[PDB]
Enzyme design. Structure first.
Site, PDB file in Angstrom:
ATOM      1  N   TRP A  83      16.794 -70.302 -30.390  1.00  9.26           N
ATOM      2  CA  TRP A  83      17.379 -69.086 -31.013  1.00  9.26           C
ATOM      3  C   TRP A  83      18.431 -68.451 -30.088  1.00  9.26           C
ATOM      4  O   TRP A  83      18.262 -67.279 -29.656  1.00  9.26           O
ATOM      5  CB  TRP A  83      16.284 -68.080 -31.393  1.00  9.26           C
ATOM      6  CG  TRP A  83      15.298 -68.577 -32.404  1.00  9.26           C
ATOM      7  CD1 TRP A  83      15.430 -69.627 -33.277  1.00  9.26           C
ATOM      8  CD2 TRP A  83      14.011 -68.000 -32.660  1.00  9.26           C
ATOM      9  NE1 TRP A  83      14.286 -69.756 -34.019  1.00  9.26           N
ATOM     10  CE2 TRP A  83      13.430 -68.731 -33.715  1.00  9.26           C
ATOM     11  CE3 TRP A  83      13.322 -66.901 -32.149  1.00  9.26           C
ATOM     12  CZ2 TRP A  83      12.161 -68.416 -34.220  1.00  9.26           C
ATOM     13  CZ3 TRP A  83      12.066 -66.610 -32.626  1.00  9.26           C
ATOM     14  CH2 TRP A  83      11.474 -67.379 -33.627  1.00  9.26           C
ATOM     15  N   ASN A 121      24.367 -76.502 -33.803  1.00 17.18           N
ATOM     16  CA  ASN A 121      24.404 -76.164 -35.247  1.00 17.18           C
ATOM     17  C   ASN A 121      24.401 -74.640 -35.463  1.00 17.18           C
ATOM     18  O   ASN A 121      25.026 -74.150 -36.453  1.00 17.18           O
ATOM     19  CB  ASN A 121      23.198 -76.754 -35.980  1.00 17.18           C
ATOM     20  CG  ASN A 121      23.245 -76.484 -37.466  1.00 17.18           C
ATOM     21  OD1 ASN A 121      24.161 -76.978 -38.156  1.00 17.18           O
ATOM     22  ND2 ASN A 121      22.285 -75.701 -37.942  1.00 17.18           N
ATOM     23  N   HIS A 122      23.595 -73.912 -34.705  1.00 15.47           N
ATOM     24  CA  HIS A 122      23.269 -72.508 -35.046  1.00 15.47           C
ATOM     25  C   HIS A 122      22.971 -71.621 -33.837  1.00 15.47           C
ATOM     26  O   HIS A 122      22.611 -72.116 -32.750  1.00 15.47           O
ATOM     27  CB  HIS A 122      22.117 -72.480 -36.056  1.00 15.47           C
ATOM     28  CG  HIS A 122      20.849 -73.054 -35.532  1.00 15.47           C
ATOM     29  ND1 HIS A 122      20.454 -74.366 -35.806  1.00 15.47           N
ATOM     30  CD2 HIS A 122      19.871 -72.497 -34.783  1.00 15.47           C
ATOM     31  CE1 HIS A 122      19.293 -74.589 -35.203  1.00 15.47           C
ATOM     32  NE2 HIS A 122      18.901 -73.449 -34.588  1.00 15.47           N
ATOM     33  N   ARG A 204      19.410 -84.060 -24.974  1.00 13.23           N
ATOM     34  CA  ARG A 204      18.787 -84.224 -26.306  1.00 13.23           C
ATOM     35  C   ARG A 204      19.468 -83.189 -27.182  1.00 13.23           C
ATOM     36  O   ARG A 204      19.456 -81.991 -26.839  1.00 13.23           O
ATOM     37  CB  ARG A 204      17.267 -84.069 -26.279  1.00 13.23           C
ATOM     38  CG  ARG A 204      16.631 -84.192 -27.655  1.00 13.23           C
ATOM     39  CD  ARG A 204      16.536 -82.830 -28.333  1.00 13.23           C
ATOM     40  NE  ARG A 204      15.687 -82.987 -29.479  1.00 13.23           N
ATOM     41  CZ  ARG A 204      15.031 -82.049 -30.124  1.00 13.23           C
ATOM     42  NH1 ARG A 204      15.110 -80.776 -29.776  1.00 13.23           N
ATOM     43  NH2 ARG A 204      14.272 -82.432 -31.133  1.00 13.23           N
ATOM     44  N   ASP A 206      19.381 -81.206 -30.584  1.00 15.32           N
ATOM     45  CA  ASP A 206      18.578 -80.731 -31.724  1.00 15.32           C
ATOM     46  C   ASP A 206      19.491 -80.658 -32.942  1.00 15.32           C
ATOM     47  O   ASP A 206      20.693 -80.415 -32.756  1.00 15.32           O
ATOM     48  CB  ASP A 206      18.011 -79.342 -31.402  1.00 15.32           C
ATOM     49  CG  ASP A 206      16.796 -78.906 -32.225  1.00 15.32           C
ATOM     50  OD1 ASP A 206      15.992 -79.875 -32.817  1.00 15.32           O
ATOM     51  OD2 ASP A 206      16.543 -77.720 -32.325  1.00 15.32           O
ATOM     52  N   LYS A 209      21.735 -83.563 -37.946  1.00 14.18           N
ATOM     53  CA  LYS A 209      22.140 -83.941 -39.331  1.00 14.18           C
ATOM     54  C   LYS A 209      22.769 -82.753 -40.049  1.00 14.18           C
ATOM     55  O   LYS A 209      23.343 -82.981 -41.159  1.00 14.18           O
ATOM     56  CB  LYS A 209      20.948 -84.493 -40.109  1.00 14.18           C
ATOM     57  CG  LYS A 209      19.973 -83.461 -40.669  1.00 14.18           C
ATOM     58  CD  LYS A 209      18.831 -84.111 -41.423  1.00 14.18           C
ATOM     59  CE  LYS A 209      17.873 -83.100 -42.003  1.00 14.18           C
ATOM     60  NZ  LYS A 209      16.776 -83.766 -42.717  1.00 14.18           N
ATOM     61  N   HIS A 210      22.568 -81.528 -39.521  1.00 19.52           N
ATOM     62  CA  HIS A 210      23.081 -80.241 -40.081  1.00 19.52           C
ATOM     63  C   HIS A 210      24.510 -79.947 -39.626  1.00 19.52           C
ATOM     64  O   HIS A 210      25.084 -78.954 -40.070  1.00 19.52           O
ATOM     65  CB  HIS A 210      22.120 -79.122 -39.693  1.00 19.52           C
ATOM     66  CG  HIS A 210      20.797 -79.310 -40.340  1.00 19.52           C
ATOM     67  ND1 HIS A 210      20.599 -78.987 -41.662  1.00 19.52           N
ATOM     68  CD2 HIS A 210      19.650 -79.844 -39.881  1.00 19.52           C
ATOM     69  CE1 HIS A 210      19.372 -79.287 -42.002  1.00 19.52           C
ATOM     70  NE2 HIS A 210      18.763 -79.803 -40.921  1.00 19.52           N
ATOM     71  N   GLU A 230      18.454 -85.605 -32.446  1.00 16.37           N
ATOM     72  CA  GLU A 230      17.443 -85.372 -33.505  1.00 16.37           C
ATOM     73  C   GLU A 230      18.103 -85.460 -34.885  1.00 16.37           C
ATOM     74  O   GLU A 230      18.762 -84.513 -35.322  1.00 16.37           O
ATOM     75  CB  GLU A 230      16.739 -84.023 -33.381  1.00 16.37           C
ATOM     76  CG  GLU A 230      15.567 -83.931 -34.326  1.00 16.37           C
ATOM     77  CD  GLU A 230      15.311 -82.573 -34.954  1.00 16.37           C
ATOM     78  OE1 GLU A 230      16.272 -81.853 -35.255  1.00 16.37           O
ATOM     79  OE2 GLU A 230      14.125 -82.259 -35.162  1.00 16.37           O
ATOM     80  N   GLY A 234      13.104 -90.290 -41.828  1.00 15.24           N
ATOM     81  CA  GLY A 234      12.355 -91.532 -41.672  1.00 15.24           C
ATOM     82  C   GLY A 234      13.086 -92.726 -42.234  1.00 15.24           C
ATOM     83  O   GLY A 234      12.601 -93.839 -42.002  1.00 15.24           O
ATOM     84  N   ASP A 297       7.199 -80.441 -33.133  1.00 18.41           N
ATOM     85  CA  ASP A 297       7.658 -80.292 -34.530  1.00 18.41           C
ATOM     86  C   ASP A 297       6.742 -81.008 -35.515  1.00 18.41           C
ATOM     87  O   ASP A 297       7.045 -80.933 -36.722  1.00 18.41           O
ATOM     88  CB  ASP A 297       9.085 -80.812 -34.673  1.00 18.41           C
ATOM     89  CG  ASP A 297      10.085 -80.011 -33.854  1.00 18.41           C
ATOM     90  OD1 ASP A 297       9.795 -78.784 -33.561  1.00 18.41           O
ATOM     91  OD2 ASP A 297      11.126 -80.603 -33.502  1.00 18.41           O
TER      92      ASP A 297
HETATM   93 CA   LIG Z   1      25.535 -76.670 -40.015  1.00 21.24          CA
END
Ligand SMILES: [Ca+2]
Ligand SMILES: *[C@@H]1O[C@H](CO)[C@@H](O)[C@H](O)[C@H]1NC(C)=O
Length: 476
Positions: A83, A121-122, A204, A206, A209-210, A230, A234, A297
């Site tokens: 965060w 990503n965020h 690594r 995180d 894919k986003h 990450e 699957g 996770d």
């Molecule tokens: Ca995004």
């Protein structure tokens, strides 16, 4: 360190907040349900490097280091590091810039690597999307840096997966517009200067894919080190293509069948055997993926079964599979927490015993891998070969002809009966002595070239030529 440097490593993954305190307490309260900082630090990790290195790991993966939202949210504190608000400051809960540098140098002095977790990503914000004051984010201090507010509802729509926000109306994860050149350039400058300031050996990443694929090659290039993504899917047809834009991905394709194969005496060896072969041929390079069965996770392996033989087998697999072994802090003490937050237990509450059954198993498995690699520069590029399966068994071969490790794994569990498995396809010659390096027994290859593998106690068997163990400390 390069992707080639990383092939031979074995990773201990830990939560900086949960692994070790500065005061070295093994009794400080850490109630996972509170979701608050329990007080683990970079200095605490330094003080326990003997514990980590004693299991034969060559590297650690630590949770993100950037300064976080300050609030205790309805979902607790940012103890996990995911965060972020100010990427140019460190999370002071874990220590100072000198402490993170001291951890890098302490690992380097032992010949170990530092891998650091990062999010592109965020950011994170306490509160709903409509309440976000974009001025708290450094350097992305404006709404202009972010995708318009929306949640991901259709995970089948890759556009929505990349352009909409994760999190919820309680803790928002403002989604950076990673298609903007200014966001690309900021992240690229940041990641190169992070790796450089703290002498970091690998990352690594995180939440890969986003973020749209064209972001990632520039990011991996800027980091100047091995990056493992990450990509939470699957399906190897979805996940393995991310290796076209990043050095490595975490082996989520192997995860689901590996967990299924060993979590019960009913598990499918077929699904695991089949996925090993799909990943070997359909992933750009199986030898740069990260093998795991346990993380922060998903439910821990012991949450599915407390059978210690099943846990030994799944650990042996993770260490002897193609790619980089990744064991999650607590796995070695048979921790059994369920989904988040129950799977973020404090490692110190174990008392860090170096004599536990899984500490010993992981030590033995990493010992033969580390030894085999020191004598066989081809071990890491020889693609793992499943040579046998039945209802309760999988055997696999890896390494240069004459030096191959041959591994026989079982899901019979600790009540398993005693029998001889006549194993064909191991590639050793008749009369060859093999050491089973977990139990330190010798087995001799038969006239026909079949290995009479002693099976008992549902135990994993790891075979290596006895003659090749000359001068190693293994099974002394
Ligand atoms: Ca995004
Ligand atoms: C690395 O150090 C320099 C101070 O020389 C600074 O300009 C940069 O922001 C630092 N990078 C990180 C990620 O802390």
């Amino acid at each position: 360190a390069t992707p080639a440097d990383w092939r031979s490593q074995s990773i201990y993954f830990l939560l900086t907040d949960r692994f070790a305190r500065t005061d070295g307490s093994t009794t400080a309260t850490c109630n996972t349900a509170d979701q608050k900082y329990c007080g683990g630090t970079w200095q605490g990790i330094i003080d326990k490097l003997d514990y980590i290195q004693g299991m034969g790991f060559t590297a650690i993966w630590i949770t993100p280091v950037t300064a976080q939202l300050p609030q205790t949210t309805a979902y607790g504190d940012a103890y996990h590091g995911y965060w972020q608000q100010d990427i140019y400051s460190l999370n002071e809960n874990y220590g100072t810039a000198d402490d993170l540098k001291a951890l890098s140098s302490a690992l380097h002095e032992r010949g170990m690597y530092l891998m650091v977790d990062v999010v592109a990503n965020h950011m994170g914000y306490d509160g709903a999307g409509s309440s976000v004051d974009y001025s708290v984010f450094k350097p992305f201090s404006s709404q202009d840096y972010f995708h318009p507010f929306c949640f991901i509802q259709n995970y089948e729509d890759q556009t929505q997966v990349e352009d909409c926000w994760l999190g919820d109306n309680t803790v928002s994860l403002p989604d950076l517009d990673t298609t903007k050149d200014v966001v690309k350039n900021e992240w690229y400058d940041w990641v190169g200067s992070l790796v450089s300031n703290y002498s970091i050996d690998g990352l690594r990443i995180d939440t890969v894919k986003h973020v749209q694929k064209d972001f990632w090659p520039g990011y991996n290039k800027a980091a100047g080190v091995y990056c493992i993504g990450e990509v939470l899917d699957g399906d190897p047809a979805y996940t393995c293509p991310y290796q076209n834009v990043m050095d490595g991905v975490l082996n989520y394709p192997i995860y689901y069948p590996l967990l299924n194969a060993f979590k019960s005496t009913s598990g499918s060896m077929d699904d695991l055997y089949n996925m090993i072969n799909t990943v070997k041929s359909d992933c750009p390079d199986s030898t740069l993926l990260g093998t795991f069965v346990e993380n922060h996770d998903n439910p821990r392996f012991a949450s599915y079964t407390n059978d210690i033989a099943l846990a030994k087998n799944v650990a042996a697999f993770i260490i002897l599979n193609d790619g980089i072994p990744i064991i999650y802090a607590g796995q070695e003490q048979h921790y059994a927490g369920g989904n988040d937050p129950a799977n973020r237990e404090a490692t110190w509450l174990s008392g860090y015993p170096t004599d536990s059954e899984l500490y010993k198993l992981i030590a033995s498995a990493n010992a033969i891998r580390n030894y085999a690699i020191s004598k066989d520069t081809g071990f890491v590029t020889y693609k793992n070969w499943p040579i046998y399966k039945d209802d309760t068994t999988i055997a696999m071969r890896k390494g240069t002809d004459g030096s191959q490790i041959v591994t026989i794994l079982s899901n019979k569990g600790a009540s398993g009966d005693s029998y001889t498995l006549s194993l064909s396809g191991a590639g050793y010659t008749a009369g060859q002595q093999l050491t089973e390096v977990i139990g330190c027994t010798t087995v001799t290859v038969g006239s026909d070239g079949n290995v009479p593998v002693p099976m008992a106690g549902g135990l994993p068997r790891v075979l290596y030529p006895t003659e090749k163990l000359a001068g190693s400390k293994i099974c002394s």
